[PDB]
């Protein structure tokens, strides 16, 4: 059974950073990627970026480059999100999914349950 | 991004057991050079995450019901629900895959009458 699993909900005051986990079991972590999907209250879906774990590949939606920031560890099949200089714009729930190989197949197949952070 | 694939959506209360189907446009043809059409369909029912109905344009997920079906051009899709049920009940969105970034449509939202 795959299973993500997301770190918990958080209050951020703005200008701080915060730092999101998504915990990937049940499969190889490193035969796939891991994407990260905004929602900010209300809103709609906004794509953040992928990390292959593998390759050490990463890919960002511009609009969020240099706010977000993508790791992954390997040794624990966790993918991480830090979040920097937060302001209101940042509250919403952040997802993470699993991103495929070539082919099209296990794109946001599997997804963690999100995680709300509110900048107060 | 002045470049990114723009997806627009179209708008619809459904009443239970009907049907609707949903349309989505992309600024630029999603088949790829593969032979793929790289359209997903999701439904994110309230308070839950996205789930991934439809792949590759016309692919139905795993453990997706058969209600749900996709179809397209390559610039216009949609999806068709059948029977609609209180379960369907959420915001449904399009997205792209064939360029970066990837790029979702608005949603569109699904209430049961
Ligand atoms: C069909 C075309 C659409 N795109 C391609 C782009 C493709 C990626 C290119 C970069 C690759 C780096 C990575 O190191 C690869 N390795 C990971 C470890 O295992 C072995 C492979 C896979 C990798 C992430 C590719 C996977 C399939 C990718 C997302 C493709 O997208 C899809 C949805 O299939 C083109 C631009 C937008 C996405």
């Known amino acids: 059974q795959v299973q993500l699993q997301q770190s918990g909900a958080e209050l951020a005051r703005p200008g701080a950073s915060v730092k999101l986990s998504c915990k990937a079991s049940?499969?190889?972590?490193?035969?796939?990627?891991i994407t990260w999907v905004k929602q900010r209250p209300g809103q709609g879906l906004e794509w953040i970026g992928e990390?292959?774990?593998?390759?050490?590949?990463?890919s960002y939606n511009e609009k969020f480059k240099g706010k977000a920031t993508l790791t992954a560890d390997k040794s624990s099949s966790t993918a991480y999100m830090e979040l920097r200089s937060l302001t209101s714009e940042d509250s919403a729930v952040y997802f993470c999914?699993?991103?495929?190989?070539?082919?099209?197949?296990?794109?946001?197949?599997?997804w963690g349950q999100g995680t709300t952070l509110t900048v107060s | 991004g002045a470049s990114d694939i723009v997806i627009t959506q179209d708008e619809l209360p459904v009443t239970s057991g009907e049907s609707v189907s949903i349309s989505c446009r992309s600024s630029?043809?999603?088949?790829?050079?593969?032979?793929?059409?790289?359209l997903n369909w999701f439904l994110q029912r309230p308070g839950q995450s996205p789930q991934l109905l439809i792949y590759?344009?016309?692919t139905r997920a795993s453990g997706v019901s058969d209600r749900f079906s996709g179809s397209g051009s390559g610039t216009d899709f949609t999806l068709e629900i059948r029977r609609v049920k209180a379960e369907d009940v959420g915001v449904y969105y399009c997205?792209?895959?064939?360029?970066?970034?990837?790029?979702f449509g608005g949603g569109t939202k699904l209430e049961i009458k």
């Open positions: 049940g499969y190889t972590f490193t035969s796939y990627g």
């Open positions: 630029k043809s999603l088949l790829y050079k593969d032979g793929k059409t790289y």
């Open positions: 590759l344009m016309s």
């Open positions: 999914a699993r991103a495929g190989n070539w082919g099209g197949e296990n794109f946001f197949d599997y």
């Open positions: 990390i292959y774990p593998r390759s050490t590949y990463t």
């Open positions: 997205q792209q895959l064939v360029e970066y970034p990837y790029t």
